[PDB]
Amino acid sequence: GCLTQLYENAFFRGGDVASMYTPNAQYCQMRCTFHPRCLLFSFLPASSINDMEKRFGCFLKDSVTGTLPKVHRTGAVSGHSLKQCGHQISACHRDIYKGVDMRGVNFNVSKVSSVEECQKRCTNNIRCQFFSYATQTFHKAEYRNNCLLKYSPGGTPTAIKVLSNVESGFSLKPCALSEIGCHMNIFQHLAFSDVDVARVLTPDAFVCRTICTYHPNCLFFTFYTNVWKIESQRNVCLLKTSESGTPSSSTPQENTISGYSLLTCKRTLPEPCHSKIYPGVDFGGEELNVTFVKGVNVCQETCTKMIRCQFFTYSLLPEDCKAEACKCFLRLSMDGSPTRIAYGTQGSSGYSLRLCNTVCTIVGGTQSSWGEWPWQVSLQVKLTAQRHLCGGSLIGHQWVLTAAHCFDGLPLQDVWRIYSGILQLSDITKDTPFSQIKEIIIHQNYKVSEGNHDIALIKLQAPLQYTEFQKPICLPSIYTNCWVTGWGFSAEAGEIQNILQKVNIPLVTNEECQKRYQDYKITQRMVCAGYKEGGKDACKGDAGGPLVCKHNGMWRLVGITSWGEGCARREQPGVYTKVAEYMDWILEKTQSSD
Ligand SMILES: [Cl-]
Ligand code: NA
């Protein structure tokens, strides 16, 4: 299943399938996730190895048992792919690396005022995969304040150096943040030419397009259909690029279908899996396993659960079948595509769903941006007027976690509208879709006007589909990088904020919080956060929203915004419901309702 655990001071021996340079272990893990054979990775930070060639080395590995020998190596980081991890699978990597130079082809150089502006330029340039920003103090005077846009084979830097006054990062195309947008155009009976970066067999042009989208050096493609009379031409998916970034020519050709990478689409990218089953076709590859199963959908499930399976063929031949079960051939190849696509077969083929990514275990702030906090929701009541009252956190397709006190005046579910995948409240019109409540589950021990057990589950009438802008937060099973978000007041006697706000706040021990609030019992089921001087806090209209902390590269929901004495006062921390202490309640209530 999903294995997010990391191994400190550890390096796996052998099983090597690919290597590259990455700025950190999380980016290496992402490459492992998307690589067709990687199950395990090991990463060397520059401090961990003298050998210049091995610093920032990312080593992608496979094993027929899913396990490898490992050695102690100070500073090395090892882990698993995130295959089988559902919505945790994403190619979005927002991190900026200060004091790091990521080398490649420096195809475009311009002046900018910040590393964030350089990143936006990279995101909105079709050829840019990664960038470096040379600050005012960069040693080469002729690069000071310049943004260098870059590409490389495979989209990984050709070298990574520790270097002062350089700040590097990746394009945010895979965060669905491009402003250029994307061409959904499919051209029938039309071929492209240019530079072929890969050649694979696909059952249709749509699989070809998704493979192009996630291939670092694909910008557009041409598919040759199974109608070709020339056998060696059939089902060929050519992944392509051009020195310019756009096709330099087009050629009319029967039984050819062309299109573009969808990596520059806004809000939502195609899912990085091919979920259709194809009747009458056989997908050739190396045999992993054969078992009898009850129908082709179970065969798909079997392939998905066997993490090395890439694709399968379910046989409908009588010699391969019993009364209600037939042979399911689990297969793989070097690149995740079949080695042969044969039609006129008695059987049905498809792919593993292991990478399909569709529960998991403000005062003094600044404006958020798209996809930063994709679990944040707005809880609103419509009577005659409509107004935002509370936040919430998406924790599954049909579940939001919030504060019980949001419902004190209106526990009736019928007047509530829940907005998700929204940054600015001004964007909501009478046309904007919203979720409706099917069930409110207020904690059994919560009492109106009292602070204990301030936690409620909301079951939506319809599931939400995940996008880069709308997806869940993982729940916990110490923290130093915690953030609170919402549209609440920006002053104690303040107003609702149009743009979702964020603020970074340190956690405070219960001991300390209890000293600040001598009139209330601060329990082990509460968590507190704030500054001695105040000035940064949640406020009215933020309640029920998230307190999230990023630990070992992973966001998790640590608190639910609950109360404070006023907002952002000196020596008066915010108090949050401590989600870890309600995990038994969350799992029981969601399993019992479901
Ligand atoms: Cl598809
Ligand atoms: Na697809």
Residue numbers in the entry: 1 to 358, 363 to 365, 372 to 487, 494 to 610
Original authors' sentences:
To determine a full‐length PKa structure recombinant optimized PK active site mutant S559A was activated by proteolytic cleavage of the activation loop Arg371‐Ile372 using FXIIa. PKa crystallized in the presence of inhibitor benzamidine and the structure was determined to 1.3 Å resolution. The PKa protease structure consists of two β‐barrels and the benzamidine inhibitor is observed bound in the active site S1 pocket with the Ile372 residue from the activation loop forming the characteristic electrostatic interaction with Asp558. The full‐length structure defines the interactions formed between the PKa protease domain and the apple domains whereby two extended loops “latch” on to the apple domains with specific interactions shown in Fig. 1C. Residues 476 to 484 form a latch loop1 and residues 566 to 570 comprise latch loop2. Latch loop1 contains a central β‐hairpin that inserts the salt bridged residues Glu478‐Lys481 into a pocket at the center of the apple domain disc where Glu478 forms hydrogen bonds with Arg267 and Ser90. Latch loop2 adopts an extended β‐hairpin and on its tip residue Lys566 forms a salt bridge to Asp95 from the apple 2 domain and Gly569 in latch loop2 forms a hydrogen bond to Gln26 from the apple 1 domain topside α‐helix. An alternate conformation occurs in the apple 4 domain where an internal Cys321‐Cys326 disulfide distinguishes PK as a monomer precluding formation of the extensive disulfide‐linked dimer interface observed in FXI 19. A comparison of the full‐length structures of PKa with the FXI zymogen revealed a large unexpected conformational 180° rotational rearrangement of the intact apple domain disc relative to the protease domain. The PKa latch loop1 is a key pivot point for this relative rotation as it contains the Cys364‐Cys484 disulfide which anchors the protease domain to the apple domains after cleavage of the Arg371‐Ile373 peptide bond in the activation loop.
